[PDB]
């Protein structure tokens with residue numbers, strides 16, 4: 361149709377308008393009719409699976425871990441394939457759903473895609489109700505939403521918030537961190553509620569439980585802003601988030617809790633008011649928003665990824681321009697030689713290390729299986745487990761205090777992350 365190359369379109373209908381399950385299949389059917397080599401990009405594998413069914417019997421290859429011109433994969437999968445030697449089709453049409461996702465792989469993907477549009481080699485469609493720079497925390501909905509500013513608990517409580525537990529419906533509660541969510545969920549559970557906790561690490565297995573089991577509360581991080589569907593009538597929003605910040609170019613901290621963006625607030629609010637024959641959904645929020653970023657590490661990490669993706673001779677892809685000033689970096693300053701790039705990739709995939717940390721280790725000429733850097737840092741880089749120095753048994757047979765040469769707070773911000781990094785340090789993966 362007008363997928364006739366040459367162009368980037370931002371489909372920005374209000375939340376719940378039918379972008380993912382009404383408009384998306386229409387575009388795919390058009391793309392197949394016009395025989396365009398197309399890729400579909402979902403934010404998560406959970407959402408990718410729900411797209412399988414909305415794309416009823418259409419020739420779509422699902423690269424989710426014949427005459428097949430149309431691919432479906434998640435944001436991170438797409439970006440991950442671009443970094444590897446493994447061949448990626450120069451698609452004629454790029455479709456990114458939930459294109460507001462601010463994770464490094466999603467930022468990198470938007471940059472790569474938009475760059476391909478500018479070069480005149482492809483068309484692109486970014487689907488999101490909240491494009492970069494939106495200041496509207498209260499967009500349109502299918503049904504009226506009762507918006508109420510309240511004092512939202514960020515700690516366990518024994519009194520003062522009756523309205524929280526005095527609610528017979530189902531509530532989605534956005535928290536700024538996993539650990540904060542743990543405390544709130546434990547309080548709700550003790551008060552007799554059934555609670556499901558969602559985070560980025562647990563999402564792909566815990567989200568499916570929000571359907572096939574009963575629940576009163578979902579306590580979730582900002583991961584549920586990316587196309588997550590709940591049968592709920594209430595959203596409690598702390599309006600808080602944590603921001604990864606690179607300090608003095610030498611370490612990453614998790615600053616906050618801190619005001620979420622208008623986009624995030626709109627996406628959080630947008631979890632309800634979706635049912636057209638159902639008014640009464642409430643959005644209860646505990647504070648204001650802010651354009652917080654620009655020292656947000658994710659956009660620098662996105663640059664690290666994009667610098668190591670090849671398009672054609674000497675060419676480095678630009679960030680999607682509405683996002684391009686979110687970071688102070690020179691394009692190509694993180695480009696690694698091919699051997700270092702390989703280590704960089706493995707550290708992110710098999711190593712499951714944050715992009716920033718993986719770059720530090722790889723650019724220092726360290727091989728993937730060399731874990732000495734996990735112990736030879738300054739003593740202020742010491743990682744604590746419950747107010748006591750965390751220790752692992754090394755591959756060489758010593759009990760060493762975990763003390764990484766480069767400190768990234770994301771490797772120990774909760775128990776699951778610490779367990780994973782402790783295992784990485786012991787050379788177990």
Ligand SMILES: Nc1ncnc2c1ncn2[C@@H]1O[C@H](COP(=O)(O)OP(=O)(O)OP(=O)(O)O)[C@@H](O)[C@H]1O
Pocket residue numbers: 373374375376377378379380381382414458488489502587630634635
């Ligand atoms: N298979 C389906 N087809 C069409 N509509 C559906 C389907 N399943 C659920 N719906 C409902 O129809 C509405 C359309 O939802 P959809 O996810 O397409 O909106 P959206 O524009 O993607 O929202 P957002 O921008 O917040 O992701 C929702 O309120 C949803 O609850």
Ligand SMILES: [Mn+2]
Pocket residue numbers: 379380457458587
């Ligand atoms: Mn959607």
